Design a protein around this ligand. Structure first.
Ligand code: NI
Ligand code: NI
Ligand code: OH
Lengths: 100, 122, 570
């Protein structure tokens, strides 16, 4: 496989994301860490799909609505930034106030 | 009863910076091409050459703007700015290496300024 | 010019009269005073004030008052008070509380806080800075628990144990000279301040003193070894001769005598009580009266704090499991009823609220969780504020008094008790540099930056492969202060005066800074800060009721509490 430590670290993000997706599908309101996990995993998957940075930033703000999470969580996250390998190299994607 | 952690409930009132000091207002014009950013606490005689103003008054004074904030000067754009005293020991060293000592010996500062071609000297 | 309060607070931090809320709780701290002067605030970054020829000096060398590190615009909260100021440390020692900057161009700069070319700047704008938490009940059973302790701003672990051993699991002791020397040698790899407690049992002075002369920092008297009054007498004699603290885990079976027998055995001396509430052990059921004596320093373990609707069942099950209790014998049932008693916990809530109990600890991996001492302390504080309402000393609708009293329970009071006050335990000049920086929204969950000895040791930091440090996943990682040979310089290992004078570190090859324990047998319950009340504690032998000042103490367990699932993944 040949993995630098970065991939081993992002695998934890993917694990947290799938756990959060299971919890949300069950019918619970998410709290801060797994909401962050969902947002960052959607960003990474969208980057892998082949979207641009601007459209990724645009759709990052319409993935979680404020009534899917715990009370007061929307104020936890000012922004979320992640490293993602776009078809032309690794880039940093930052989305502000992702939940509103 | 919405809950937000780390939220502040600030009191009623206003914060004044540089209390009990004399305030001056001068006209600054940029005759250069590249835009110029100027900090708050940076001394106002060691500023860039291309700046044009009454350099004589701008000895031993600094910008009366909130700390960390900066003033921007576009090419060919002039504006009025506010200056206040530089308190404490009133000794200044370094920067552009023009004063390198007390601020009461303005003659040496002006002589070095017009020797090195600083604009606005009077 | 005029500056609105909101923008100033957002860009620099709260000022006089501003209140800040600690996490999801309902607690607000109001800044009592401030040392900096408006308009002369110091901040770093591109185009900021701290530069050569500006508020950063550029002439003086290291010796001429030039600092080595400064935290700017921090918000100190200690037993001395709550105020916003700048922190300056040099050579790993806190040297200045005040405002930092060049006195050449600024006004009102404290003379000892000159910042020059050889300084480091850390921007603590909008962050809460606290002294390193002190832990007094740590069972050394796992070397990966030091990271869990560090994640809660704990910088001093004081306990015994040699790993996953039977006695190490049961009690926090380091029996004998050989084992204690081995533990001292193994202490080099732990990036934390460490104190080692030896076995405090025996029938002669010499075997007990041999441990203190080997490098012990205190003594533990646990029931499973045998807490006979003779052992208490011998340990106390060795202690006051050697000027070290003694921790007592009182008998629970009453096989050797009741509580009054132990009370006479101590004979009015100064002792430190472990888990005075009694769930973890003690004289069933009237142990808690030790909280009322003017010469006994109380403490508490975490798993009973605060009182929720699930403590009793889990406590009964762990008592079932650890001690191999069975349900085919009614003696085990009687033991469970006589040990886990809800009325006493409901009373301990108020006694913590009323300042009766002065400290708080963990008892890690020994019926107590290492990584939630501050968490559970603040949970108890918020629950008591919700239930019993505001205290009698509150003014202007602020919770300064409660915050000070509850923060004295895990930073300064254990330092007073253990005699290590003059090096650590508070933000004060002349003390070591062990600081914890929290974000206000994360206060009590995850420490943002833990700094030991002037070098950042732990941090909630993001991915190492990014161009900037924030991107996910942010996790707790040990910084450069816990790698290489730098660990030997940012840590203090506490050690007895007698064993220090004997050149024990030289014989062992110790390399960390060696700390001295002193001024320990001269103190009592009258010296603790904000928690110095002594009274009568009445425990009804049958009804298990608790009466204080002729009034029954009890509280109802709550179903939901903050500081909870809103933050944790699981
Ligand atoms: Ni114990
Ligand atoms: Ni213990
Ligand atoms: O214990």
């Amino acid at each position: 496989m040949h993995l630098n430590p970065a991939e081993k670290e992002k695998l934890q993000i993917f694990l947290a994301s799938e756990l959060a997706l299971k919890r949300k599908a069950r019918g619970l309101k998410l709290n801060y860490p797994e909401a962050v996990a969902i947002i960052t995993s959607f960003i990474m998957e969208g980057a892998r799909d082949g979207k641009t940075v601007a459209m990724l930033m645009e759709e990052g703000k319409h993935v979680l609505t404020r009534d899917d999470v715990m009370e007061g969580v929307p104020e936890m996250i000012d922004d979320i930034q992640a490293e993602a390998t776009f078809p032309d190299g690794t880039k940093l994607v930052t989305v502000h106030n992702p939940i509103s | 009863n919405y809950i937000v952690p780390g939220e502040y409930r600030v009191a009623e009132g206003e914060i004044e910076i540089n209390a009990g000091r004399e305030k001056t207002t001068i006209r600054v014009s940029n005759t250069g091409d590249r835009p110029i950013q100027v900090g708050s606490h940076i001394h106002f005689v060691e500023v860039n050459k291309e700046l044009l103003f009454d350099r004589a008054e701008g000895i031993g004074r600094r910008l009366n703007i909130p700390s960390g904030t900066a003033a921007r000067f576009e090419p060919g754009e002039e504006m009025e700015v506010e200056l206040t005293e530089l308190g404490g020991n009133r000794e200044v060293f370094g920067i552009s290496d023009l004063t390198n000592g007390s601020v009461d010996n303005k003659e040496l500062i002006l002589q070095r300024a017009k020797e090195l071609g600083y604009k606005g000297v009077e | 010019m005029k500056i609105n309060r909101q923008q100033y607070a957002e860009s620099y931090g709260p000022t006089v009269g501003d209140q800040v809320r600690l996490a999801d709780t309902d607690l607000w701290i109001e800044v009592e005073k401030d040392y900096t002067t408006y308009g002369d605030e110091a901040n770093f970054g591109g185009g900021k004030v701290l530069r050569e020829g500006m508020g950063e000096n550029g002439t003086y060398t290291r010796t001429e008052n030039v600092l080595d590190l400064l935290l700017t615009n921090a918000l100190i909260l200690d037993y001395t008070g709550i105020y916003k100021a700048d922190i300056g440390v040099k050579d790993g020692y806190i040297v200045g509380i005040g405002k930092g900057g060049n006195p050449d161009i600024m006004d009102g700069v404290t003379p000892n806080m000159i910042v020059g070319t050889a300084t480091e700047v850390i921007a603590a704008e909008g962050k809460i800075v606290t002294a390193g938490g002190i832990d007094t009940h740590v069972h050394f059973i796992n070397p990966d628990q030091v990271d869990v302790a560090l994640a809660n701003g704990i910088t001093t672990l004081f306990g015994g144990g040699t790993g996953p051993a039977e006695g190490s699991k049961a009690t926090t002791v380091t029996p004998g000279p050989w084992n204690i020397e081995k533990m001292l040698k193994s202490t080099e790899g732990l990036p934390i301040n460490v104190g080692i407690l030896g076995k405090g049992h025996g029938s002669s002075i010499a075997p007990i003193m041999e441990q203190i002369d080997a490098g012990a920092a205190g003594l533990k008297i646990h029931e499973d070894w045998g807490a006979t009054p003779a052992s208490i007498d011998r340990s106390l004699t060795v202690a006051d001769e050697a000027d070290v603290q003694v921790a007592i885990h009182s008998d629970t079976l009453n096989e050797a005598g009741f509580l009054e027998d132990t009370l006479r055995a101590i004979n009015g001396r100064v002792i430190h009580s472990f888990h005075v509430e009694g769930a973890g052990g003690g004289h069933a059921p009237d142990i808690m009266a030790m909280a009322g004596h003017p010469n006994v320093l109380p403490s508490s373990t975490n798993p009973t704090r605060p009182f929720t609707v699930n403590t009793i069942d889990e406590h009964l099950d762990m008592l079932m499991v650890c001690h191999h209790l069975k349900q085919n014998i009614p003696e085990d049932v009687a033991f469970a009823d006589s040990r886990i008693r809800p009325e006493t916990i409901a009373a301990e809530d108020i006694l913590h609220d009323l300042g009766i109990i002065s400290m708080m600890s963990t008892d890690a991996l020994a019926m107590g969780r290492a990584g939630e001492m501050v968490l559970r302390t603040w949970q108890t504080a918020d629950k008591m504020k919700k239930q019993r309402g505001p205290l009698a000393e509150e003014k202007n609708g602020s919770d300064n008094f409660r915050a000070k009293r509850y923060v004295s329970k895990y930073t300064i009071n254990p330092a007073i008790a253990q005699g290590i006050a003059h090096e650590v335990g508070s933000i004060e000049e002349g003390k070591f540099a062990d600081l914890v920086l929290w974000e206000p929204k994360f206060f009590g969950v995850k420490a943002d930056r833990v700094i030991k000895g002037g070098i950042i040791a732990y941090a909630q930091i993001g991915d190492p492969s990014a161009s900037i440090p924030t991107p996910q996943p942010v996790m707790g990682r040990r910084m450069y202060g816990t790698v290489g040979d730098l660990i030997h310089d940012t840590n203090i290992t506490f050690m007895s005066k007698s064993s220090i004078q004997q050149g024990v570190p030289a014989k062992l090859g110790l390399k960390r800074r060696i700390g001295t324990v002193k001024n320990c047998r001269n103190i009592g319950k009258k010296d603790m800060k904000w928690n110095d009340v002594t009274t009568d504690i009445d425990i009804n032998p049958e009804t298990y009721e608790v009466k204080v000042d002729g009034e029954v103490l009890t509280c109802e367990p709550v179903k939901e509490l903050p500081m909870a699932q809103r933050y944790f993944l699981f």
